[model samples]
Target: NTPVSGNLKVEFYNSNPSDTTNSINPQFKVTNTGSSAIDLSKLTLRYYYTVDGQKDQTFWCDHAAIIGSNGSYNGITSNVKGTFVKMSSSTNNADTYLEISFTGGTLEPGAHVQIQGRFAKNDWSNYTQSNDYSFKSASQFVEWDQVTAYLNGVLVWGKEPGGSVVPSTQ
Candidate 1:
């Protein structure tokens, strides 16, 4: 079995005002768990939120990087206002997942990065389904040897280390 080398986390916060004037802040963090240094200059972060187990929406952030040693990378914090509307009139809880991808970088040995983000809302009702509003979250990290072949600076064409499934297979 292959050992997991990186960890990412995304968090949602509830602002005190609960009004339209304030912004929803999402914090992202990336940490390195391996034994070497990883260049993060060409990194991209993708965000996904779900409701009722159906894929609701996806968002992307580009143009950033962070090096990891036996430590962590703070990535970026986004204060997005009106980015999230009320999913329903009764609840405000939204289940979300954050995925980070690195391109054009070199990871020495035993290096990893951890990323996180936060979103704010008045309540958790916005994420509730019918009977139960349970959620499962996941993060995937991939790296490719050929940096030039990356699409959108995150996905590669061939099978490489941490590479994704071939695009045409889907």
Candidate 2:
């Protein structure tokens, strides 16, 4: 049986220094903007960062979790927590970028983050259907920029100035 598919949307809100720094506490908010209900238990939020235009340089969070059902879950206002710490090489002065990836989650609709960092890269940029699937399941991918600040840890700046990713059924 094909699992019920839903859409997911992420946005960037607030960042410290407003210009990127080093070793700073960064916070972000995420929401589920789909029509169906999403299982937060299966969600995994991953962070990736890179310096300059080199793909060899990158960093990731050891462990990341999402908020449970309802408007509020646990003690988290919106799953807010300090998950990353920017390295010396990943400072504001460097050409750094950040990206976030969501996987293994069943997200519902009308969920969004109030205050979050705008992602700079998305790996699923050229998402396409997989022939392995009998029905040719479609996938969504993107690449974002890795942003690091002094006051804030490693955070992801959204793609481009006004570019964002949205789920599509093709």
Stretches > 4 Å off in candidate 2: 1-6, 18-20, 46-48, 51-73, 76-108, 112-170
Query: Can you give the TM-score per candidate against the true fold?
Result: 0.31, 0.34
What is the C-alpha lDDT profile of model 2 across 1-170, one tens digit per residue? Answer: 11112244433222233223221222334556556665544333333232222333223233334554566433323332323323444423322333333433434456543333322212412211111010111122212222211101211222221122221311
List the RMSD of every prediction in angstroms. Answer: 11.2, 14.6
Cα lDDT of model 1 by residue, 1-170, tens digit? 22221322222222222323222222333333345454554444433333443433333332233444545454332321113322333233334433344434543444433333333233422433222221222243333211112234533332222334334542
Clashes of 2: 45
What is residue 40's positional error in candidate 1, in angstroms?
1.8
Deviation from native of the Cα of residue 146 in model 2, angstroms: 8.5
Off by over 4 Å in 1: 1-38, 50-108, 121-125, 129-152, 156-165, 168-170
